[PDB]
Symmetry: D2
Subunit: 115 residues, 4 copies
């Protein structure tokens, strides 16, 4: 259910492959200058009680064309069915001086669908 293309409400698109040994690999896009590498892990043997599938991934916003000196991690779960969804919470950290560290990390949430 996870392998494929997922869309968020803000435009963003991501293409993942879920490997047989819990690897997640792919790209995150919004054109070439907006494409970034992703890598992650997921539970390759979830429960059967109807629970969701735990997963996580990271993006560092540096590519061949620009560098924001920042990285985002998403933590969440995959819910299959007709309205398959991935529900997440995320953290985005910027590199800062020690003086500015207190304001280095944003938090939020995202929901991704297959359509």
């Amino acid at each position: 259910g996870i392998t494929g293309t997922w869309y968020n409400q803000l435009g963003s698109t991501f293409i993942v492959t879920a490997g047989a040994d819990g690897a997640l690999t792919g790209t995150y896009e919004s054109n070439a200058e907006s494409r970034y590498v992703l890598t992650g892990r997921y539970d390759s043997a979830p429960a059967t009680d109807g629970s969701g599938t735990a997963l996580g991934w990271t993006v560092a916003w540096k590519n061949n064309y620009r560098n924001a000196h920042s990285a985002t991690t998403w933590s969440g779960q995959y819910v299959g069915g007709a309205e398959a969804r991935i529900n997440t919470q995320w953290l985005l950290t910027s590199g800062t001086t020690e003086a500015n560290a207190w304001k280095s990390t944003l938090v939020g949430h995202d929901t991704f669908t297959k359509v």
Copy 2:
């Protein structure tokens, strides 16, 4: 650099290699939770940081499944590496477990971890 052996305040061990391409790969060995032995990790970092004395942004994930156990959960650390006399990595983390829908409101824990190359 980031490449090396790291320890957190709880005696957890993080062995990591930083690739020239911004890739992070390694093994995590925990001190707390449903955990035994090493788990695989993967992440990304900024391979061309600011020169201004800023930190190096980075992040990684562990899914808590190995050949010994499975806790149906994953943790993501997001933070920065600061070099210097005392090198450390400062992170915030999120831990999400699989849950039914009725219980998803309590599926995520939040916390912070500090890693150093010296074991406490």
Copy 3:
């Protein structure tokens, strides 16, 4: 506009009053047994550029009938519009021993409406 009766996605109900110099007061519910006191603050003089109104509140989960030994804080903003709404992120801390402190705090998000 902030004064009134609000509802979240899960069926919970919160009645508040916004005071003249930024005080928030009221009760949260989900039967008297499930009724709890809330207190907080808001920006009593927001910007005029279209920005929302920042606020926060706290509830400790103890009343005359029940005590979970825990507390939640909500941090967010009020937005006036077609549907006035308050979007929040929240933190819930449980009293734990020091060995269990690493797992004492949950994070989530909630959206309230007058409907």
Copy 4:
């Protein structure tokens, strides 16, 4: 144990009174130009088994002198003993337009002591 003056490691002070009813009230000193009102709640009947006492508070960053159009909430626990402390996680939310609501909320942590 909670009533009193508390310090963090970045030059911030707060003075709090803990009421019999579970009320927290006081002032947060980030010069009167820098003093802001605080309000919160705490568990007025904790466990005696070594657990900390759950609590939370809010400061909206407006006083009679300045206004940052934002609010911080602290969620954590009080731990007594010779080295008493209050361990917290916080969220700071700023007023933003809808277009910038993804970047409205910062997350962090802080530890307060009696000295």
